[PDB]
Write a protein that binds this ligand. Structure first.
Ligand SMILES: [Mg+2]
Ligand SMILES: [Mg+2]
Ligand SMILES: [Mg+2]
Ligand SMILES: [Mg+2]
Ligand SMILES: [Zn+2]
Lengths: 95, 214, 70, 128, 202, 76, 119
RNA sequence: CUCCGCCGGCACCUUAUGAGAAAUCAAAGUCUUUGGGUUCCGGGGGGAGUAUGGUCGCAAGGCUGAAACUUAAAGGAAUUGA
């Protein structure tokens, strides 16, 4: 039995893909297999943004934003619910 | 009594058919089994195997019996029925119903010399169902049916007289084995023979010929 | 008819996509024959200006070089 | 590599089985057209073009759907006119129809022709 | 001079915007689409559309009893087209949802053995397609430039997703079948006007 | 077909697809038989129709429509 | 925990099919309507179905409703079904299309048409 | 950069009319209607890539590689249940 068409990693036309480190357990998994999300979070959540616009010394100042491209392995992604086990049929779609 | 629900059943009830040649020639879906008794009178049915299949549930494992019946008159009509049911007898009945629904036409041929009625299959035919494949090869007059007990019991209904049988795959699984035999028969009218070469003059379908009674 | 978009060697009777073109410049009112896919710079014998630049496909003409297929 | 008279027949089987009206053949041969002459003589394909402009060649046959299977026996056999009799049973569907085409010193010809002219040769292929 | 039935009918289809297919095409019916506009949607030879319309009309008329013909439209843009088509041609329209098993389950309440099956869309009405493939049921389907036209015997190349086109095309079939059967005697006059087939939404 | 006596032994010489010439077997429930009427003059119909038959193969490909078309352009 | 079962809802729709002008909004009036127009075996089921039919009233009386079919509403929906404009609203006297839609007609030989114009 | 077409790539999406034990595959199709050419390679599970012999390597090891005996199943795919 073969669980997936591409094996869980998108590797065609290559022989080796440079590995990376999980952001949680530091496991070495290939860059084309790691669950890679580009999280862009506020510095503070919206219940503490009025309170910082009431403290910025210069008016018209916009809050910076944290841009960071976190990597996870499959183990940590499943465990932290980044991704979930989907049915045999729903498994295939990429949307 | 009957009160047929398919208009084929209606026409058969008023008896404006005589033999299943027209229904076969027009490839119509036969949906009421009580057409075929009135259209094929000399019909004989035998069950061969009752193999019990078992689904397993929380409480235990629940058994059903499925029946493999062959029906057919010894003149080129043979039909296979498979039916799974709780009880042996009702499995037999449902199988015989589906089998008399699955009557199909088997064409015969001569080995080399066209004297007497046709006895052997027209040519080499192959039928496959799952893993088992069966071949019938034409045989000269008076060589019998060389085949296993199952396809020989199919062919003795099909009316074939002489034939050479070569089989592949797991012939022990009687379901696939008899279904491959039947698939190898019901495709003997699938062979573009030179004898068919003359282009066909069409015939009105039963619906448009017996329209006014609909 | 699609037999012109269809590949060079997949047509019914395979035929070239190229042609010989007579190029005539602005500075030297004579005619010189050049090939569609020139592969080599060619210069007018008198005026010595370039007629074409080799390219992966058809050669590139210089400004004011009128050419007739032939 | 190419070992045509298979590249032609397998194209013809594929075209027929898909129901295409005409099939074209990229290389040709005197042997190829002599095979198609056997088919057309025995009434299995209708007439056809032989595009011979300048090269190996090209052909276009029109299929009438009357053919059912046609093959080449590359690994071209030796074949006596005493022992075709167990090739006809070994390959052809029955003893009434189907033809085995064997090349013989009298050119390409089918096995029934080989019975009457009593000349054997090498199997080019068959069709039925 | 005068006009031909060609003239009037092609004008009617230009008006009801039938010639405009969509962005895509299927190799099966690319033979009807003629050229692309640079915006990207295809357009259909309405002459070839009307040729197929005559084909379908002859097939309809060759039916002895029109009570054995079923026409379907699952798009709500076509129910008012199909019932008006049905009451005129004597056919039997099944508008709305198609209950699966209509053509096979013999002791179903909604059973029938139609001589012929007309569909506004093979794509949406693909269920009747599949049952027709099991019931020996010839089919005339209204194929757009996106129509996956498996199991279709006669396919009219036409837009079938518009407020006007579905109403127009069934009105063409209505008039043509009625001319064929002669209920409207020779003469382009017919006492039914097209905007009736357009669906009247609340 | 023909017995050597001349008697005819085989039953329902089956109809053949008009577009691909493979024969419709007795259980190709994906096979259809179109009737196309003929129109003559005032009235524009009588019970004179041409008949076509198509196997499951041709329909399943989808190219059944092209077959009906290209066989309807035959004249008489 | 008060959802009505099929023995309730089927009966409510079926009785509201047949008896519309003869039953009204008021719960108790519908009770006594149902007494003479149906035979049941429990006063609580009687109350149950009457109380479902009463808001079936309160929904029908303001807007349309699913399958349940009544002549006094289907006939009017047919009367507003079958109307047409005084003349066909789509007019052929002016048709505005582009070059390829004209190529249609030109390939069909029809370079000249009534009412076809260049955009 | 937009559009259309050719080749040659890496792939992907839909469908059997095909194939398959199926999973699945547009190439694992054109296979009992069996034959384009060619190399390597398997013959139930163990014992075992083990012993012995050879050979290469500094060594680890690599390549080549059995038998005795034992066993009625081992195994693949999919179904239901737990
Ligand atoms: Mg590469
Ligand atoms: Mg690697
Ligand atoms: Mg072993
Ligand atoms: Mg397993
Ligand atoms: Zn991790």
């Amino acid at each position: 039995t073969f669980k997936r068409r591409n094996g869980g990693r998108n590797k065609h036309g290559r022989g080796h893909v440079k590995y990376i480190r999980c952001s949680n357990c530091a496991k070495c998994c290939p860059k084309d297999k790691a669950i890679k999300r580009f999280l862009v979070r506020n510095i503070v959540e919206q219940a503490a943004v009025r309170d910082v616009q009431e403290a910025c010394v210069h008016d018209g100042y916009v809050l910076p934003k944290l841009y960071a491209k976190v990597h996870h392995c499959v183990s940590c992604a499943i465990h932290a619910h980044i991704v979930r086990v989907r049915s045999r049929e729903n498994r295939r779609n990429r949307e | 009594k009957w009160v047929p629900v398919t208009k084929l059943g209606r026409l058969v009830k008023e008896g404006r058919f005589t033999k299943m040649e027209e229904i076969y020639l027009h490839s119509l879906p036969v949906k009421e089994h009580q057409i075929v008794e009135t259209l094929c009178p000399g019909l004989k049915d035998e069950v061969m195997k009752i193999t019990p299949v078992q689904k397993q549930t929380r409480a235990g494992q629940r058994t059903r019996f499925k029946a493999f019946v062959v029906v057919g008159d010894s003149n080129g009509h043979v039909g296979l029925g498979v039916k799974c049911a709780k009880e042996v007898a009702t499995a037999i009945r449902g199988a015989i119903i589906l089998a008399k629904l699955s009557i199909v036409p088997v064409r015969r041929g001569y080995w080399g010399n066209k004297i007497g009625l046709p006895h052997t299959v027209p040519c080499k035919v192959t039928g496959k169902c799952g893993s088992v494949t069966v071949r019938m090869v034409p045989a000269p007059r008076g060589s019998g049916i060389v085949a296993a007990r199952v396809p020989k019991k199919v062919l003795q209904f099909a009316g074939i007289d002489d034939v050479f049988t070569s089989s592949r795959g797991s012939t022990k699984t009687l379901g696939n084995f008899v279904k491959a035999t039947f698939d190898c028969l019901m495709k003997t009218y699938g062979f573009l023979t030179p004898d068919f070469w003359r282009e066909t003059t069409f015939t009105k379908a039963p619906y448009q010929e017996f329209t006014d009674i609909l | 008819e699609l037999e012109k978009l269809k590949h060079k060697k997949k047509r019914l009777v395979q035929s070239p996509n190229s042609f010989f073109m007579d190029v005539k410049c602005q500075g030297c009112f004579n005619i010189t024959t050049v090939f569609s896919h020139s592969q080599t710079v060619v210069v007018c014998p008198g005026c010595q200006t370039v007629l074409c630049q080799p390219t992966g496909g058809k050669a590139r003409l210089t400004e004011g070089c009128s050419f007739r297929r032939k | 590599g190419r070992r045509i008279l298979n590249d032609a027949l397998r194209t013809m089987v594929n075209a027929e089985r898909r129901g295409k009206a005409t099939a074209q053949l990229q290389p040709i041969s005197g042997v190829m057209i002599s095979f198609l002459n056997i088919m057309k003589h025995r009434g299995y394909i209708k007439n056809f073009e032989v595009f011979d402009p300048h090269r190996v060649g090209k052909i276009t046959v029109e299929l009438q759907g009357r053919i059912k299977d046609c093959k080449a026996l590359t690994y071209r056999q030796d074949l006596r006119a005493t022992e075709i009799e167990k090739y006809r049973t070994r390959m052809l569907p029955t003893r009434q129809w189907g033809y085995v085409v064997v090349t013989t010193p009298n050119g390409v010809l089918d096995h029934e022709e080989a019975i009457r002219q009593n000349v054997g040769g090498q199997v080019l292929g068959y069709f039925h | 001079r005068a006009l031909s039935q060609k003239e009037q009918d092609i004008q009617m289809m230009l008006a009801a915007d039938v010639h405009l297919g969509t962005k895509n095409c299927d190799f099966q019916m690319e033979r009807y689409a003629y050229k692309r506009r640079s915006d990207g949607i295809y357009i259909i030879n309405l002459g070839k559309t009307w040729e197929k319309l005559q084909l379908a009309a002859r097939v309809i008329v060759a039916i002895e009893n029109p009570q054995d013909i079923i026409v379907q439209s699952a798009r709500p843009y076509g129910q008012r087209a199909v019932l008006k088509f049905a009451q005129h041609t004597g056919a039997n329209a099944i508008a709305g949802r198609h209950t699966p098993g209509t053509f096979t389950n013999q002791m179903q309440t909604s059973f029938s053995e139609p001589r012929l099956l007309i569909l506004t869309d093979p794509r949406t009405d693909h269920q009747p397609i599949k049952e027709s493939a099991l019931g020996n049921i010839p089919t005339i389907a209204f194929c757009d430039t996106d129509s996956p036209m498996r199991y279709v015997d006669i396919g009219i190349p036409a837009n079938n997703k518009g407020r006007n086109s579905i109403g127009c095309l069934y009105w063409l079939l209505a008039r043509m079948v009625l001319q064929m059967r002669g209920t409207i005697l020779p003469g382009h006059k017919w006492d039914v006007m097209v905007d009736l087939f357009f669906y009247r939404d609340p | 077909m023909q017995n050597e006596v001349g008697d005819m032994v085989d039953l329902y010489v089956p109809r053949k697809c008009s577009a691909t010439n493979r024969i419709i077997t007795a259980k190709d429930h994906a096979s259809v038989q179109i009737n196309i009427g003929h129109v003559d003059e005032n009235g524009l119909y009588d019970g004179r129709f041409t008949t076509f038959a198509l196997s499951g193969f041709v329909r399943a490909q989808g190219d059944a429509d092209g077959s009906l078309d290209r066989l309807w352009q035959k004249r008489k | 925990g008060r959802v009505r079962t099929k023995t309730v809802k089927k009966t409510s729709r079926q009785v509201i099919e047949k008896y519309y002008s003869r039953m009204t909004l008021d719960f108790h009036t519908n009770k006594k309507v149902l007494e003479e127009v149906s035979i049941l075996q429990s006063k609580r089921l009687r109350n149950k179905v009457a109380g479902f039919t009463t808001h079936l009233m309160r929904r029908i009386q303001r807007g349309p409703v699913r399958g349940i079919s009544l002549k006094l509403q289907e006939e009017e929906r047919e009367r507003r079904m079958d109307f047409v404009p005084e003349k066909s609203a789509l007019e052929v006297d002016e048709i505005r299309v582009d070059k390829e839609t004209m190529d249609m007609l030109a390939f069909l030989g029809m370079a000249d048409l009534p009412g076809v114009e260049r955009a």
